Amino acid sequence: NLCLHPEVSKERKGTVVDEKCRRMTNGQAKRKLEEDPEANVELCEYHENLYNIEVEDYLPKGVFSFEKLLKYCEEKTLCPYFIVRRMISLCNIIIYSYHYLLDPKIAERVSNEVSKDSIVIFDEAHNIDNVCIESLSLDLTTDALRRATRGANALDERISEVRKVDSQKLQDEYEKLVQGLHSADILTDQEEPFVETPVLPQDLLTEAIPGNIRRAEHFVSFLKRLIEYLKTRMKVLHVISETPKSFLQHLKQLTFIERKPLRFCSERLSLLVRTLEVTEVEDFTALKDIATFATLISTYEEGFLLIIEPYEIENAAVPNPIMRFTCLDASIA
Amino acid sequence: NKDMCPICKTDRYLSPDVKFLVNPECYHRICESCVDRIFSLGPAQCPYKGCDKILRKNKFKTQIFDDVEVEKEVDIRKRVFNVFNKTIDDFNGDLVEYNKYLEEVEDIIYKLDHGIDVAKTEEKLRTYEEL
Amino acid sequence: DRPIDDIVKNLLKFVVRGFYGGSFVLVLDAILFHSVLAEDDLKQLLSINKTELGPLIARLRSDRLISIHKQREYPPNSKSVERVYYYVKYPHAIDAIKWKVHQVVQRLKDDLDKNSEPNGYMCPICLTKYTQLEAVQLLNFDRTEFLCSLCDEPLVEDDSGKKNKEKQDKLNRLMDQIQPIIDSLKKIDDSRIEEN
Amino acid sequence: LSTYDVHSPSELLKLLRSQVTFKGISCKDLKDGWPQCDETINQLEEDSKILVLRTKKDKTPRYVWYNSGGNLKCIDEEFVKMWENVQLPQFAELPRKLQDLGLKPASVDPATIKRQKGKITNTHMTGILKDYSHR
Amino acid sequence: LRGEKIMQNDRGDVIIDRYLTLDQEFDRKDDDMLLHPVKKIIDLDGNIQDDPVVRGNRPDFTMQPGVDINGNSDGTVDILKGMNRLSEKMIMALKNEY
Ligand code: SF4
Ligand SMILES: [Zn+2]
Ligand SMILES: [Zn+2]
Ligand SMILES: [Zn+2]
């Protein structure tokens, strides 16, 4: 809703916009360009211009609506998204949707800027419970798991190629993991995690990575057999509803996976993707859904139900099994 | 190798009751009809070109995970986990030691799957089990 | 004029060409190009006398790839005559093809299974076949050789021990050469065909 | 003035394909005006592009037909003999056997098919009026 | 043209039916012409895209266009779009150069 880049703004998908915008502003492109001007990596003039001017002087004092904000930014050739996000601390009143305050994926970053003692107002809150229930939910289909295997296979191939040319990149991250540093410390402010934290910030474990997923290859095997297990459960010929605890117990019995490694699936995957420095993440997008499932199901145990139904659309000639991780408690979020 | 026995080429369409089993030795798919015909009398060489490993009839088992490679990792992990059994309490709360121990076990499993140091890895596994 | 009709037509043409001779292709193709052909018309089309057409029609009727229909006719200026027409009944032809293919595959599978069994024995003189279990109760007092009950002569081992690979190759060749039939049958089963 | 203006294998195939009926074309008539055609017919038969009927006294080409199917020869003689050996089951009992074997039958047993007042005083005006029994 | 649901292939007309592909091409061109940026106050594309990362539970079939057994579209959405196109054509034609 705020992008002004002629190429990225034309994208029809919000996520695609994020992928392109991050690529031009992750900071990797700028560093690569500085190292070698001959590099053909592009940038975003709107984002670059913000560096010259100070944060406190991005916009003149006053109220800036979307229409007015876009007009000013276009004239001054600046990015409204970065200006608005970076000015949260300075703003006296901040207006944003419920998804920026109840959905942990796009709320942990924003919630850190708003003041604790601020007045909170919920307008048209008669449907808030739906947002809370829909924030900690997830649906996995047969296609999602199929792409997950493809992404895992591609991830393994990329890791091998990176190992052949230079393995020092992975060694440095492994040392940091052993030291106990998490994504927050490893990743810089400019960069963003590949997989947004699906669980609430307070439920994230603070201890170090278990170790089974410290190595690049061990985590890939951990990811691979987890995907296969989900594919096995899709073959059920009748509706099965079970609590997360039962799902974890059956998972462990068949393929040896514990609760704790699953809780770090989202965090570990982001680090691995960043280390591999993959220019394109089109294939790996599928792995994002699986990573979200592992953390959600391995973090919460009460108020969530896992339902697998062979028939997503009852009026279908061929069954299309779908497994839904649904949140029943609207007060958790 | 889509839905038929590579040996007898029995299609599922003509014989829907046909089922397949895999021996943990070389993870080679084969129909139960061929298993009864060949291995029932006694052990014999696997009926694939370029494969000569001797496999017993009783060792045959059904395949759970569709991916053959994942099946090998799980079965190897099952064997390793039987020998290696420890918990966080065993280390007296030392998380660093527990994490290092888990990493070593994963390395052992990875080596066994790829057979980089099968001779040395197997010897180390045997020593721990006896001890 | 659904594609299902064309698929069934292809199955019949391939089956006839692969499992029947040349004149069989001529007869069945004519009734496939023309939905119904009279006996006299079929003879004129292929220029084959009654005797030659005899075995072809009879054999194709036995496998039910063709059906017969006899009705009385009353020509305006001739004596009433009983005419014969030939046409294809797809539900029966498909069912007959499916069962026959299954039997051939099953027979080869049984032969392959049997060959792996112990050879056995047979008497050179009276040509009587003795199984391994049956011969083990006929060995002489010296425990040296098996003696035939009828001839009282030493038995000789049976052949086919080394044919194990031969039967497997035969089974492989059939399935490789029969794949189009399996694919056509799968497509036919997917859809529905009305009785003709 | 040949009956059929055919001199090359390509021309022969075009003529046979264009035939509206399945009536064959006599090689005796076709050979007229063509110095040699038996070799061409035999070569086409080997290629499995034309159906050929041959004499019995000695192998000699006769009426030929366009081949609308696949290869004329595609099965070993051993399998052909096995196909002949198998005897088809009873006409009515075939669907039952197929269902038991696990294969969906395309036919059904024919036996299952189903084959399917007092004196009227009002005199002078008895016939003019029609009977509107219902509405 | 009149929005009547396209029943199973009927007699129709041999010649006029050949223009169906051209008519569909014209409709696509008309839809592209009608499409234009909308005022942000009433814009609905941004509302659904305001949270691009949301991946909640998929809604039931009651909140999705009807589909057939084979999975193909029922065809009711096609006639509904025709109503929108016809109304938009009428309203846009009002704002002529004159
Ligand atoms: S920095 Fe702003 S203008 Fe540039 S691509 Fe990202 S959102 Fe668009
Ligand atoms: Zn087999
Ligand atoms: Zn083998
Ligand atoms: Zn004898």
- Atom 5 (ligand 1): residue with closest C-alpha? A21
Query: How many angstroms separate the CA atoms of C60 and C96, rounded?
Result: 11
For chain B, where are the alpha helices, taking DSSP H only? 32-39, 68-83, 95-114, 118-130
Find chain A residues with C-beta within 8 A of B106's C-beta. 211-212, 215, 218
Backbone angles phi, psi at B4, to 5 degrees: -145, 155
Query: How many angstroms separate the CA atoms of D5 and D9, rounded?
Result: 12
Chain E residue with the nearest C-alpha to that of A313: E61
User: Six-digit token pair at A206?
Assistant: 């603070």
CA of C169 to the centre of ligand 2 (A): 13
Counting Cα atoms < 13 Å in the Cβ hemisphere of B54 gives 3
Query: How many angstroms separate the CA atoms of C8 and A114, rounded?
Result: 72
- Return the HEC string of B73-86: HHHHHHHHHHHCCC
**In this structure, how many other beta carbons lie within 10 angstroms of the beta carbon of residue C64?**
21
Please list, in sequence order, all residues whose beta carbon lies within 8 angstroms of the beta carbon of residue A151, skipping any fewer than 6 positions away.
A283, A284, A285, A286, A287
What residues pair up with A241 in beta bridges, in sequence order? A307
Query: How many angstroms separate the CA atoms of D3 and D7, rounded?
Result: 12
What are the contacts of E90-96 at 24+ separation with CB within 8 A? E92/E34
Q: Identity (one letter) of the amino acid at A149?
A: T
Counting Cα atoms < 13 Å in the Cβ hemisphere of C81 gives 11
Q: Is the Cβ pair E57, A134 closer than 8 Å?
A: yes
DSSP-assigned states of every residue in A239-263:
-EEE-HHHHHHHHHHHS---HHHHH
Instruction: Please answer whether residues A273 and A288 qualify as being in contact, where contact means their C-beta atoms are separated by less than 8 angstroms.
Output: no
What are the contacts of A238-241 at 24+ separation with CB within 8 A? A238/A310, A239/A307, A239/A308, A239/A309, A239/A310, A240/A307, A240/A308, A241/A305, A241/A306, A241/A307, A241/A308
Find chain B residues with C-beta within 8 A of D103's C-beta. 13-14, 16
Residues with CB under 6 A from ligand 1: A 3-5, 8, 21, 24-25, 44, 46-47, 79, 81
Classify D134 as helix, strand or coil. coil
User: Six-digit token pair at D44?
Assistant: 């086409």
Q: Identity (one letter) of the amino acid at C145?
A: E
Instruction: Please answer whether residues A274 and A210 qualify as being in contact, where contact means their C-beta atoms are separated by less than 8 angstroms.
Output: no
User: Six-digit token pair at A231?
Assistant: 């594919």
Please list, in sequence order, all residues whose beta carbon lies within 8 angstroms of the beta carbon of residue A299, skipping any fewer than 6 positions away.
A199, A203, A204, A263
Query: How many angstroms separate the CA atoms of C131 and D27, rounded?
Result: 59
Please list, in sequence order, all residues whose beta carbon lies within 8 angstroms of the beta carbon of residue B33, skipping any fewer than 6 positions away.
B5, B8, B10, B18, C109, C113
Instruction: Please answer whether residues C172 and B9 qualify as being in contact, where contact means their C-beta atoms are separated by less than 8 angstroms.
Output: yes
Residues with a beta carbon under 5 angstroms from ion ligand 4: C 123, 125-126, 148, 150-151
Please list, in sequence order, all residues whose beta carbon lies within 8 angstroms of the beta carbon of residue E42, skipping any fewer than 6 positions away.
none
Query: How many angstroms separate the CA atoms of B10 and B44, rounded?
Result: 21
Counting Cα atoms < 13 Å in the Cβ hemisphere of D94 gives 25
- Distances D11 to B21, C61, D7, D42 between C-alpha atoms, Å: 57, 37, 7, 15
User: Six-digit token pair at D96?
Assistant: 């039952």
Query: Angle, nearest 10°, between helix axes A142-165 and A265-276?
Result: 50
Which run of H or E residues covers position C33? Answer: helix C22-33
Checking DSSP bridges between strand C37-38 and strand C67-73, what pairing results, if any? unpaired
Distance from CA of C27 to the nearest CA of D (A): 10
Q: In what order do the strands lie in the sheet with C37-38?
A: C37-38, C81-87, C67-73
Query: How many angstroms separate the CA atoms of B29 and B36, rounded?
Result: 14
**Interfacial C residues in 74-93 facing D (CB < 8 Å):** 90-92
**In this structure, how many other beta carbons lie within 10 angstroms of the beta carbon of residue C55?**
12
Query: How many angstroms separate the CA atoms of D107 and D92, rounded?
Result: 9
Q: Identity (one letter) of the amino acid at A312?
A: E
Distance from CA of D1 to the nearest CA of C (A): 25
- Distances A302 to A206, A241, A246, A292, A327 between C-alpha atoms, Å: 21, 14, 12, 18, 9
Query: How many angstroms separate the CA atoms of B30 and B20, rounded?
Result: 5
- Distances D20 to B70, C6, C30, D16 between C-alpha atoms, Å: 60, 18, 12, 9
Q: Identity (one letter) of the amino acid at E61?
A: F
User: Six-digit token pair at C185?
Assistant: 């049958």
Reading phi first (left if > 0) and then psi (alpha if -120 to 50, else beta), residue A242 is in beta
Classify C127 as helix, strand or coil. coil
* Closest to A23 (Cα-Cα) out of A195, A197, A192, A269: A192
- Give the nearest partner residue to D86 out of C22, C26, C100, using CB atoms: C100
State the chains in contact with B (3 or more Cβ–Cβ pairs under 8 Å).
A, C, D
Q: Identity (one letter) of the amino acid at C45?
A: L
Which range marks the domain in which residue B28 is found?
4-62
Please list, in sequence order, all residues whose beta carbon lies within 8 angstroms of the beta carbon of residue B53, skipping any fewer than 6 positions away.
B25, B26, B45, B46
User: Six-digit token pair at E26?
Assistant: 């014209």
What residues pair up with C81 in beta bridges, in sequence order? C73
What residues pair up with C194 in beta bridges, in sequence order? none
Indicate the burial class of A126 (C-beta count within 10 angstroms; 0-12, 13-18, 19 or more). exposed
Query: How many angstroms separate the CA atoms of D18 and D13, rounded?
Result: 9
- Distances B97 to A210, A264, C174 between C-alpha atoms, Å: 11, 19, 62
Residues in chain E, how many? Answer: 98
Counting Cα atoms < 13 Å in the Cβ hemisphere of A275 gives 31
Query: How many angstroms separate the CA atoms of D121 and B119, rounded?
Result: 118
- Distances E44 to A221, C46, D114, E40, E51 between C-alpha atoms, Å: 43, 73, 61, 8, 13
Instruction: Please answer whether residues A227 and A152 qualify as being in contact, where contact means their C-beta atoms are separated by less than 8 angstroms.
Output: yes
User: Six-digit token pair at C38?
Assistant: 């009279």
Backbone angles phi, psi at C141, to 5 degrees: -65, -25
Please list, in sequence order, all residues whose beta carbon lies within 8 angstroms of the beta carbon of residue E61, skipping any fewer than 6 positions away.
A313, A314, A315, E67
- Return the HEC string of D116-127: CCCCCCCCCCCC
DSSP-assigned states of every residue in C135-167:
HTTSB-TTSS-BB-TTT--B-EE-S-STTHHHH
**Interfacial C residues in 100-119 facing D (CB < 8 Å):** 100, 102-104, 107-108
Which run of H or E residues covers position D13? Answer: helix D9-18
Q: Where are the beta strands (DSSP E) in chain A?
A: 138-141, 240-242, 304-309, 322-327
Indicate the burial class of C173 (C-beta count within 10 angstroms; 0-12, 13-18, 19 or more). middle
Classify A106 as helix, strand or coil. helix
Query: How many angstroms separate the CA atoms of A231 and A252, rounded?
Result: 15
DSSP-assigned states of every residue in A107-163:
THHHHTTS-TT-----TTGGGHHHHHHHHS-EEEEHHHHHHHHHHHHHHHHHHHHHH
Counting Cα atoms < 13 Å in the Cβ hemisphere of A68 gives 7
Find chain D residues with C-beta within 8 A of C96's C-beta. 88, 94
Query: A2, A4, A49, A77: which to mutate for ligand 1, most atoms within 8 A of CB?
Result: A4
Evaluate the CA torsion angle D37, D40, D45, D48 in order and state its sign: negative
Query: How many angstroms separate the CA atoms of C47 and C30, rounded?
Result: 12
Instruction: Please answer whether residues B55 and B63 qualify as being in contact, where contact means their C-beta atoms are separated by less than 8 angstroms.
Output: no
**In this structure, how many other beta carbons lie within 10 angstroms of the beta carbon of residue D82?**
20
Query: How many angstroms separate the CA atoms of C50 and A283, rounded?
Result: 69
Indicate the burial class of A173 (C-beta count within 10 angstroms; 0-12, 13-18, 19 or more). middle
* Closest to B84 (Cα-Cα) out of B64, B98, B69, B68: B98
Instruction: Please answer whether residues A293 and A325 qualify as being in contact, where contact means their C-beta atoms are separated by less than 8 angstroms.
Output: yes
What are the contacts of C4-9 at 24+ separation with CB within 8 A? C4/C187, C4/C188, C4/C191, C4/C193, C7/C184, C7/C187, C7/C188, C8/C90, C8/C93, C8/C94, C8/C184, C8/C188, C8/C193
- Distances E52 to A77, A133, A193, C145 between C-alpha atoms, Å: 25, 17, 15, 87
